[model samples]
Target chain A: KYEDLRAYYTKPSFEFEKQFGFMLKPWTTVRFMNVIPNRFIYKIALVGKDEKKYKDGPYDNIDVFIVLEDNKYQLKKYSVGGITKTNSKKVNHKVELSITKKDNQGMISRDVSEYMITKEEISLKELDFKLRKQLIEKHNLYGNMGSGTIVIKMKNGGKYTFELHKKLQEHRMADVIDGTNIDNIEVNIK
Target chain B: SLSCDASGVCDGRSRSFTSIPSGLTAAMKSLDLSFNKITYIGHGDLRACANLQVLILKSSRINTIEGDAFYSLGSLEHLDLSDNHLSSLSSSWFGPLSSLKYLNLMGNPYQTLGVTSLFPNLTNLQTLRIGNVETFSEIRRIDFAGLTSLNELEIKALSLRNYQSQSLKSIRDIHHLTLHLSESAFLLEIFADILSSVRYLELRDTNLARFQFSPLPVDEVSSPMKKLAFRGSVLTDESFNELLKLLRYILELSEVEFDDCTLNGLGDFNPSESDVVSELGKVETVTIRRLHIPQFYLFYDLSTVYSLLEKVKRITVENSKVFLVPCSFSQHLKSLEFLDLSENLMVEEYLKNSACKGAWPSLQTLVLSQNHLRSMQKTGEILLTLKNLTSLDISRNTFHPMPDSCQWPEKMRFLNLSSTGIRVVKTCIPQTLEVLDVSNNNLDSFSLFLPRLQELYISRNKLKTLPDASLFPVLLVMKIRENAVSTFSKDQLGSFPKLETLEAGDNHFVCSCELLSFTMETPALAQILVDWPDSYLCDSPPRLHGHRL
Candidate 1:
């Protein structure tokens, strides 16, 4: 888990603000890569601030894998930790994931995957003990293991609930933060 | 064979089609392929849509249309090919579309030859619009000879320099004609001989500054023109009087409109004014707008001209820079029923004078909006003199208070006081009032005593709560949007049992269980919530922030 690098990129940088009207803080990037005529994989990467600093090398990245259907770009299967980096000098905080799909006759099937990060792992090492504890208390992250719902409560006595999807959850959280600041909010997974 | 808003296959990323699609049902009644990249209408392109009655191909890059392109569409009655790059037209191309009744070919650079040869065989064409033709220089008699059923014709952005007077003979049956000409010096003479059957003639943006009327032959019949408009023209008093004299033969003339025209005169305002009244006999409605004259003068000249027209019933003078309403002028207007002095420099004190009373005995509708009026405390007494008045529009003024101790007519039914900057409504509304509009005001709260009020518009105000609906038992339509209201109970919304329309949007709604239940229970309320669910958002209960109810 990263703290300092995520904070620097998520904030509105002066150059990015001048180029685009809003901040260019892309928390997730989804790229479609075609491997064969009927097979493709989506290389989803969770990026942070230092990704912009390294022009040619990767530093602290989390990747999610999904295969595409034969005719269309529909999601067919996905697995974690299927690919490894040959150059270890690039990646610093790499996450290992295990996911798979089973095709029985014409009916396709899938399984649940889980990932978690607690307050103790997300705190920055350079910060003071008290400040680090507060940072850790606010930066808890978890991957949705099943098709469930997550409810977020804001300090303004407002509540919002959304179903689990990588892009949809992130976009809804961004919308809530845009409406109100992020400091006065709490997330509840159900 | 299916019917959809769009046809002729298109990719998800593109809006225009590369080629015309086939296999359309023969039962198709209408087809609209506008705003596309269709360049040509080749033969048999629309053969499947043989029964099409209405075809719209506007704003398409259509330049070449094969002569037999529309051979199958013999039932087409309305065709609009406007806003295209068509430079020329052939009569043979339209021969198959003989059933066309309304044809709009505007926004095309058509040559004179193309325009003259366009409508030769369209015998059933009734209405034609050919505006914004830059290449057309003149219109000849033969151009309209074949359009036997043409009753209405509109042409704009064209120059007819050497147009012959004989050309009018071809369109003798035309009832309504509009020409936005750059030159119209010979129009008066040309139309007098051939416009015997025309009922409406509109000449806009034409040079009539040096117009001189020539008397028609004594054997010629009088024009059947009923409504004549000379908008955006320049006319001297002498020329206007001469034109009136020439039109005296038109016994059926009724309405005359002069919008944004310059009326020049310097002599005694009342002496020559009678000359115009005597010539315009039997005329009833007169509208004069933006009439530029010598500065700082009472509209005495224009007033005398209107007062002497004994048969006139309605007179509207808007934005004419006239500040004072002549006190004794109403004595001559015995038959006038409607007077509109909107968009002028009128102060409330002008009507407070004693001379303003007992005027316009038969007047029923009065419009005084968009003026410099500040208060109506004393002027309201003068307005009560019109016992027959029923509707009044005093909107867009600076009046802030609904004047106390002012008695309105008992028969008044409609009143519009919008954008008056009034903060409260304490004045007693007449019991007979049916419609009241106080929109775009600074009103924070108000109580209505109107017993018969049916429609009310209090939008764009600062009301924190809905008004007491019990007081409006017969209210049918209410618009109270763009306010600071945050909550409403079910009883407050269901108070008006007869309410048909309630438009309340752009408010800080706290979507509680009660509010959501109220919206869901009222079936009729869903129809008026444009942008529904999006407009009803939650502003509280942190968990539901930005959530639409």
Candidate 2:
């Protein structure tokens, strides 16, 4: 009982309007970037600006981009003018699998996977592309019509997520502007 | 007519009346006509008050009284005519006061007049106060003839040279006597023969430079004195030593007090050393206040008098020039329980070097407030040696944070460190403390591990956050007023289950929505919120500016 309560309160989730006055969907990839310990940089790709889907078909080119820098984590946008992104020349590959289940109280619990990586420096672009491919293959992201969730685990037991979900549920459709789907999905990397 | 209560006691004090009011019934038992404008007590002024037993005419502007003024007050027992302008008193004025037991004729100007016939019939008078009167150069043998039953006598501002010793010896059975005479040498000679009957003696504003005991036999001068007080006197070394030698004859002496006196050289008096020890051993309590002496002169030398120091249970030496606590002083004070050395120029070095070889096994309460104590390095060790110390007050000093390496007594319960310039309290606090007061200091942050603390006073500090309540589970009263605290969460306050009163006023409180909602929660929490609602006002949020929570 104590473990359940601890798990319920300690779940890594953010609240809308209370924490940051924003909301996020389940399909957005939230890169939990850490340049130094105790400091983080959160990077997410916009649905239309960074990722483009096909007009009516399911098959779409999925391109992944990753940036690595030695400077401290700044809260500015990655698309800012002074930022520089590095591309990898050598690549290393690894795969890990983990299952997640949602409880009745909207709490998501995950099991610890045995597939772990050593604390060695790797190319950021290569790791990002490899993890995206593993998530898309395991969850069938191209064929699934509904939203799906996948987590990118770090060596320090921290997790980031890429989620695909609707902006508003059925009961929240009346508050939509101009009868268009509001993309109010924003992910928080913890 | 003056108003009388249901018990027939008239209180007409401070009334702007020029004459004595009439129409008092015979049933009146007590009358208070003090602080008035009455000038004279006419013949028939109180004729109707026949049953009056107590009459207070003090502070009245009366210069004269008719010879038969008190003729009808036959039942009066207590009469106070003090603070009047009467230079001469007629003998027949008090003839009708045969039932008088207490008489006060103080603050009168009876100069050089022989009052031998005054109160000649009032044999039942037990207390007589004729003090602060004009100089009575001569006192006849029959001046106190009728005061055979007097138990207490107070006579001040008098010249004893012209007064015959037979006049004072005529009064029988005086248990308490207060004399403020100018001619101390002559008065001591006369009083030495008469003080054997007195159990309490108080000498005020007298010079004891030439004081000498009268040549009376030891058996004849066996004093029954128990308490002696010398206030506002100047004593030389010889006179003080002679006074101590005279005190040896007082077999029943228990308490001695010297207040506002100037000592010439108390340290030079060495009467065989053991004589003073054995002489002062009978005294249980000694108090010295406002004692002034010259520089480099020792105020008290307890080293040579170990017997006296060992027997003293309580001693207070306040507002004096005594700076050093001699190394061997504490070695002899095994029976000392309470010591108050406040308002002096005491430093920690004196207390540190006080060659205390053993612990003060019986010491309980120690007060060293308003001194020049800046550090507690050695004093803290001295305190820890006292195992049974319960209360310690080191307030109004200049001590900073107590070193963590120091330790307090385990059984200590009450500690007062107020106004000691402490900025942080990180250690040296006993876990068994129940009441701690660190108020009026420069403390900005404090954390104590005292679990048994019930009352805490940390007011007038610079604290911005309240102490964690998990440390003190049984806290009942907390005073944190006049601090810099702007907010307190409900969980931080609700952790204490026994909290009853919390005084957090005069702080920078921000009455936000969280505080408002906490106040509307459980009844216990809401009651604590409304305790000081006026002081719990908002400091921000333009919509709720200055709104009380």
Candidate 3:
């Protein structure tokens, strides 16, 4: 029933994240437990800079947040944690989420930086299909989850080290940025 | 009388009436007849409210109730008759309420009579409160024998005269019991028999001076009681000592609490011969609050005071006149994770003049709200040594100014200094703080450069404008309520690119087309207020003065 809001709002957030992703502190895991009531009790987590590293690599784990009234998790617009590189050591790993239409017209403009950039576009239309979800367990005599805490994991895969920031309001999901109503977002790779 | 809604739910509270109103209907799902003057509940008075699922008649000057007062409310699941005038009750009154799950008869003056059960047919009732009994003598197994589905039974005995042994054990399903009893030997007898089936026991307003280790036999440690809490109890030195000794007998006891208590701290103790120290090690949490310590015990003791609680991870001591937490807590409590010392007589000496030179190595969170603390500079100087302390609160303390230089622990993230008479915020604040609170202060201006700060509370201050948003790199929550912020600029709202949920209400705004449109006409910005248009009044341009925006 609320799929248009999910597609235009949250889907664009995921699709645009290919250019610029959510940031995380070192050795921390950020989780967004949805405050809305829906089926399948969904939540989203982004695992960043973990200490359990092997000699070999492939360590980008984005475990996250909703479905339609019956279907996907729409992330409330939140930039509480700043946009900075936590995994790699550099200044050029900055993801440009505002990719303009002219950039898609093949007239690509580049910002001069010392680090040579590598560009890649991956379709998560099934990051949608693959990314599949407990908020909690009870019944459908249901209502909204008024308040919840965001869990950020710590040093050695533990709860003791996990930093729990509480008193979070998910109405922060109301999309507003730069004092402008968020209708649609355009991703530009700079 | 109050009107009923379309869903057949009538709210007839806070009205003046002597009898049942004429507007009651048979299809009503719920009816609230509280705060009225309805006295009699004779037969057929509620026959029309056959579908009533919830009926509240609290404080309605109700005294006389016919035996079949609730005969027509067979579907009533919730019945609240708290704070009424009823001296006698009978099982026949609830004979037809088989579907009743919650029944509150708390504030009535009633008596518990013979072995005949008061709820003979309420086999499905889950919660039953007949507390504040004017005359409660004894409990026989027959009283609650048929209440098999009963999970909680609250009976505040005004006088606990007797207890037929094992009377509570017969109701096999009652897992929790709450009582309000005084100094009586019958409590020892009552606790001994119910220790097997009851999982949690809360004895509120109980006199524990005479309570001893002889309440139940200690020959065996096989008991089902997992938690115990006492409220409004007066405990002397012997009582506080006996309470800890009692913990050694309950085999599965894990959590204990004593709130609103008056007790002297653990006095001089002599280790006994039968000290089974293992049972005392199983406790995980202890909370004692609203306490009045009568002349701090060997509260000044450095040894043998807190050794028994080494394994406990969490402890809460609030409003307890705790002027000091003798270094013994940091030395003996090895597993302490969180310690709340709020609402106490704590001063700067509790931190700066502490006895322990050794750091509180394992503690993570500490709250010292509502105390006599005056200096943030000195508190930070001492607390910076607790390398693991992440959260600290010192709200509602004596007023003080910030020192130019200070050091918080390297990992400190959350700091609350609200209502501390903070006049100016200088560089004494550390940049490591993510959540900072300076609300309710006398400050006129504020400045800080914290890049990683997320949530900033500067409410109830005298600031005439919002803080420079760029000072905090990625702030999410900004509380600027109750300030003198006038005529906010369009560029200032744009400065907060990453902000969410601004509590800007209760401020005197200088309203105009540009500022008004940014808050009301703009959806992106208006929704950011957790409280929008609430107390947002204009204080500018003469004509708009004193008017709500």
Best by TM-score: 3
Encode model 1's per-residue lDDT on B1-549: one tens digit a residue. Answer: 224545333221224654455666676777767777788778888888888888888788888888778888888899998898888777777888889898988778775535446777777899998757356566666666676545788777445555656666666566888878765565765566456657788888876657766666554666778888888887765666666765656777889899988766542333443455454577889999999875222121344354345668998999997555544455456688888999997765445321255567778888889988876664556677778889988899988566445678767899888888888886545668899999999988868677789999998999988888877899988888887788877777778877777777666777678677776778565774555656666778788867776
Each prediction's DockQ against the real complex = 0.00, 0.00, 0.01
Docking level for model 3: incorrect
Q: TM-score, chain A, per candidate? A: 0.22, 0.25, 0.18
Report residue A179 deviation for candidate 1 (angstroms).
80
Q: Lowest lDDT 10-mer window, candidate 1 chain B?
A: B295-304
> Per-residue CA lDDT of candidate 2, range B249-319, in tens?
67778889999998774344546644343448378888899997753222223344565567888888999
The digit string of per-residue lDDT tens for model 2 on A50-165 reads 12211211111122222322223332312111111221232233344554544445666554343333212222223223433443345332332224554445544544344434
lDDT of 3 by residue, A21-92 (tens): 221222223433211111111222322222221111211222222222221222223222111112222222
Provide the global lDDT of candidate 3 against the true structure: 0.62
Scored against the native two-chain complex, candidate 2 gets a DockQ of: 0.00
